[PDB]
Amino acid sequence: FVGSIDQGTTSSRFLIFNGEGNPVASHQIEFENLYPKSGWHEQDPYELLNSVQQCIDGAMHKFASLGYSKENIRAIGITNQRETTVVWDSVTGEPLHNAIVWPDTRTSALVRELKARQSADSLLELCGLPLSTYPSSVKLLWLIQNVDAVKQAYEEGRLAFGTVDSWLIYKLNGGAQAERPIHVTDSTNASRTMFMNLRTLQYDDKLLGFFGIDRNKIKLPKIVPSSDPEAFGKVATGALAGVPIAGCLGDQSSALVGQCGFSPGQAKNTYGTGCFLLYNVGTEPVISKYGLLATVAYDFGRGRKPVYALEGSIAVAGAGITFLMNNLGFAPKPSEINALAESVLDNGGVVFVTAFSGLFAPYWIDDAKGTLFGITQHTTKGHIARATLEATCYQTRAILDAMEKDSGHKLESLAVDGGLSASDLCMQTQADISGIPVDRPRMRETTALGAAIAAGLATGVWRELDHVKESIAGGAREVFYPKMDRKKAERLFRKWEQAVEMSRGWVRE
Amino acid sequence: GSFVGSIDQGTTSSRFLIFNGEGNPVASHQIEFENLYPKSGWHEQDPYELLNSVQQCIDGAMHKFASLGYSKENIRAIGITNQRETTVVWDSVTGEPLHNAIVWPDTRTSALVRELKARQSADSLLELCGLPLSTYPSSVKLLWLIQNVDAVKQAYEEGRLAFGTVDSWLIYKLNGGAQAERPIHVTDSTNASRTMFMNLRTLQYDDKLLGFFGIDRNKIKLPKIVPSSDPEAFGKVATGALAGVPIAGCLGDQSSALVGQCGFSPGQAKNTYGTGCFLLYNVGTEPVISKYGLLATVAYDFGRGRKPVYALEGSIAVAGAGITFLMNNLGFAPKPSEINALAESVLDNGGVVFVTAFSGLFAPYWIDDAKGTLFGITQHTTKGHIARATLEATCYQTRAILDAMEKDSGHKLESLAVDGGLSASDLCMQTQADISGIPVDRPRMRETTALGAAIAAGLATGVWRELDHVKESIAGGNAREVFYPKMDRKKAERLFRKWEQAVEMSRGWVRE
């Protein structure tokens, strides 16, 4: 009845859902990347554009294998990797260069000079973001500045910029060769560029004046809401041709919607090499005083007000496990690392400050390295494994507490997906440390369900939010509850904060 | 023939060895015996399990001695070296113990010590006896026994109580105990310098010291302090395989190790490795009270008209314990050989530093609130970095103690001899020479501690005439034996610099 496009960094895919949130079709084909110098990442635009409509042609032929068709489906939404900068010609509808994916770090030079300018300190309170290498403001500028090929398209009047969501929507309505050429972005992606006032949801002339981008010389994408039938046009050519595009959400905002994290204080944590945390702060935007990112969680328009969020990341969660295995020869497999941590009753007094490349929000300690405290002849691999897992939960709490202070709303729930969210012990400890229930849903493609939720509300599939989350019932092991005395959990977190402070100042030059 | 026998009564084992004139042993026997741990921190021994193990070693050893065609006629005399500070109480008329021995690492005196410190005349003890109040000295053990054992308190009151370090106990019995012509209740200056009952410059007892502990020299028979090399004060073995063989040497074990290395010049030091380290530093005829927490004791009292020699002492709690930790606790490798190999497998510590303060840090740092702390871990850290850091920790703590020794004494470090345990790791000691900037001497003759007692005995009986005759004879003798510095002083000083930073960043971890 509804469906979803989930294009990202490694791959595309196209799932199609029902009124209960159950995915009844999928098709996913990968694609590879370049590293043409340390810190450089690129991607020919058409590759993933073609990648995605390759997915829909197979995904939707399987779809009809049980007698369903487009006429049975109302609209489709889009969720996409963020911060990726694309550039093309007003005239052609064709790339005037290749793309700069978010991992790229060629802008470091540019960022360090931008950070010097006097009015660089006024940006954060307006776009909600720190000057960095990920934002699209600097990827685009670097090209206007450095690139030999298409500085003139800026100068001549024929250049158009877009995030991935816009490029897809562009050609999927018929490129420049269509009745109504659709060149737009949703709020959750434009919050990433550093061109948008977070309070206005509209391009700010002060932020463009900082980077020197003249709107008369460049064609930017019209910012629209994440749920709208008219504004995303329709699908140009394919099995879904003529079906309305009605959804668009950035990568990690869409996941929150799929988990139905619609209330202030609701957070989610995605584990991996590290963590990525997202915190729903409500209808009023919040600028972090702790180095966290402020973004748009979702903008369903339709009369309702936009909901914002705070963003936080941790460099080391799963890397801590790999370290104990490959670097220390504890075990040759991650499961056995949990077994070594369920080995022992407690951390034995051990604390592992996993600051391999320093520490980040909320601490911001650049002169620390990995530091292991509390070792005795009684310490064993179990204790160190247990502490390594605890390091992840302490840094999670530290950020969540920071978003509590930033936002003025206390934490109410946390949902978690990712390799180390599989550790029952790790997830139980988070509930003990955070004093709040830790949710772990079986459903996997949350990040694509959000784009479909948005398209559905635009089209009457779901009446409201309170309705979206009643429909999902259709689709220890799912929820972990605080079992430790609140006093013992404060004691653990205090030894950890103590260890962090005593880690400061290791690297002297 | 003419050989010299040596009883080495240790805290875990007893052994009896028989040395020729050039310090090489030809007969040996060793016995691990029972150590009792009745509760947390307490450590006891049956005083007869120590005598018995010694006697068994004498039987076993000279069985081997005879197989070579020798006998007692070929043994001029016998030397004794023992675990220090281990306390024994016995009835001065029956000769039978009144309580198990309390071995030196016992902790039961923590309350007695913490209170004695309060008594406010304690700051004077260090300059008289060379030691501060610890759980280790015999005084507080003897006191705990009295304050908590009616059996000894009675014998005390009745005037029939005798205390003695293990050396006194042994010589008392091997001469026949009571019930003998020429009974012997004597201790050597080295062992007597560990009780806190004796004045270090005097080499005699101090009434003010025993006034501090509530001990009167009439109600208790103290062993007679005698030279470590006396032809007649130690008497002779009465029965057994060595009946009639004179005893002429007696030295605390750590002093005997220094003598076995021929460390008689001021500035010569030695390090005995084990679970931890014991370092001794020769400082000449004048005793030197430490300002860095080191212990001042007697190095050796060889008589024959030569002034006693004193020493400074330090100890590290974690040297071999660190290797054991990496192998068993972290599964790195199952033998010290492979830990070394893993340490040589990489070029350097990779920026890793391991403050091996499992039970806090002792001299000269005196940090009680630190625990084992490992710095410098990145995703590029491998087991050889940590292995390297673990061996380096022992060397840094060694250099720390030796630099305190130089400052206290005024003598530049002239040499360092090494025996036991981690001594066998060429990279550990190569690194030690690198860090301290002096050559490191490792002899291949392993029973260095047993040798020092035989030296004392032989000097009292003419096996060696003077002390330059002794090191001449030893040299009458695979692995290397000398490690020379290889490192840029700058890099060596950077490594020690990072260590001292890590030590300082490690304090304050433990809170109560």
Author numbering:
A (entry chain A): 67 to 541, 550 to 583
B (entry chain B): 65 to 541, 549 to 583
Paper text:
Here, we report the first structure of glycerol kinase from the thermophilic filamentous fungus Chaetomium thermophilum (CtGK). Overall, the CtGK polypeptide chain can be divided into two distinct domains classified by Pfam as FGGY_N (residues 65–325) and FGGY_C (residues 331–583) connected by a flexible region.
We initially determined CtGK in an apo form using ethylene glycol as a cryoprotective agent. Initial molecular replacement efforts using a conventional approach were unsuccessful, we, therefore, decided to solve the structure using a MoRDa automated structure refined pipeline. The electron density map allowed for building the residue ranges 65 (or 67 for chain B) to 583. A short loop of 8 (or 9) amino acids (542–548/9) connecting the α-helix H18 and a β-strand S18 could not be modeled due to insufficient electron density. This likely reflects the high flexibility of this loop. The physiological dimer is not contained in the ASU but completed by a symmetry-related chain forming a rather elongated assembly (A:B’ and B:A’). Although crystals were grown from the same condition, the collected datasets were processed in different space groups.
